[PDB]
Design a protein around this ligand. Sequence first.
Ligand code: HEM
Ligand SMILES: CC(C)=C[C@H](O)C/C(C)=C/CC/C(C)=C/Cc1c(C)[nH]c2ccccc2c1=O
Length: 401
Amino acid sequence: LALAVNPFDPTFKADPYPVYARLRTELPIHRSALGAWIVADYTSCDKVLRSRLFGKDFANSTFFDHLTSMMGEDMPPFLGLGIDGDARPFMLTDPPEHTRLRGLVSDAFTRSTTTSMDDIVLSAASSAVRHLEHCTDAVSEVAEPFPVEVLSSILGIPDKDRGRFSEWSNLVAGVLDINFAIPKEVADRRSAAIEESIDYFRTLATSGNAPEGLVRRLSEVSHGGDQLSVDEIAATCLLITVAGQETTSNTIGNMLITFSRHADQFEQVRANPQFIENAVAEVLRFEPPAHEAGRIALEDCEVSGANITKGDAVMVLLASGNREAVERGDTFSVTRPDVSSLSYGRGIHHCLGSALANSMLQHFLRELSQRYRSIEVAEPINYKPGMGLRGPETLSVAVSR
Ligand code: HEM
Ligand SMILES: CC(C)=C[C@H](O)C/C(C)=C/CC/C(C)=C/Cc1c(C)[nH]c2ccccc2c1=O
């Protein structure tokens, strides 16, 4: 009973795994009575992410009404409060809408993320890996600019707007997570940036020669007469700008913390470079940037003797499931000839950007291990606030050639 009260943030934040452990041995599923259900075991986690009895129409759910009443506080700007009720082009939706949007978007997205763009991912990774030896904070000087540079290039942001995009990208990044520890002027400041980047994205799309890249390809995509509207194109641009920022930056920070804590596993990478991909999957497993994915039951349901009611919110603990996805799951091992993970979700909503995040993370680690013999981060680590995401706020790293 005192286990439930334990998720979250009484510096459950700083280390949640032993508590995730308690959950799996004792209380695999429970009503949070903050509001939602909480799910901790690999098998049910997979099961719920995959099932067509669970969806993501979050704006039309009672969940935020409930959360807000419980918190006694107004919702901060959040992806999927959508824009004006319409959370749809944010993929916080179910078939047949999600199906239509996913198909059109992923067709353009892949064409903008092929091995032709690889050189610029490497360039961004190596610059960042290089910045690490003369930075004060690896979060704001290295992890956060790397995905901003990459996405700017994927999207075809013109040279002149790079400064504008990077500023927007900064205000919007926290709109991925829920955080009720956000003053007013900052909600506003962040709201303006949702509005201004949607304004800008429309205009770039309707205005022919957007450079080669995603904005332009989102315009050209056509599946037998079917095609994205211009508000769909701009909302998708924003979704992609938010989706790929803090997930990627948190993971760069967490990767760093993890090789600091396990110097031998790093040694393995620098000495065995054929394991670079397996190591990335392992970081993402051991320290995922998102500890939860969310679902809404579309139907009264049974998931392992638990009784879920139409319209209940279900919090899927990706971070917990992962710790039992492989044998000895509490050991960080980059040599796992395996790497089963929930960090990208499963089923129809499987992270669309996951080949790109993997590419980014792999080039980053490859440059990292080729450039440096050791990395050490100063302990203890301060983590960003928020409900579902986990990664460091600041980071001091010592590095050696
Ligand atoms: C950095 C590592 C990343 C992780 C750990 C991550 C994780 C996620 C997770 C947990 C979801 C929810 C999946 C579910 O509900 O089952 C998601 C969805 C999504 N992600 Fe990411 N992501 C990452 C990087 C990216 C990047 C770089 C992009 C874009 C460039 C991206 C674009 C999206 C999109 C568009 C969706 C919605 C998919 C849908 O509903 O069909 N992801 N990803
Ligand atoms: C998934 C979801 C809507 C969860 C809850 O409603 C709110 C919550 C506590 C979120 C924390 C982080 C979060 C939104 C995680 C899953 C997820 C990620 C990582 N990226 C996305 C990108 C685009 C669209 C949806 C998601 C998503 O749901």
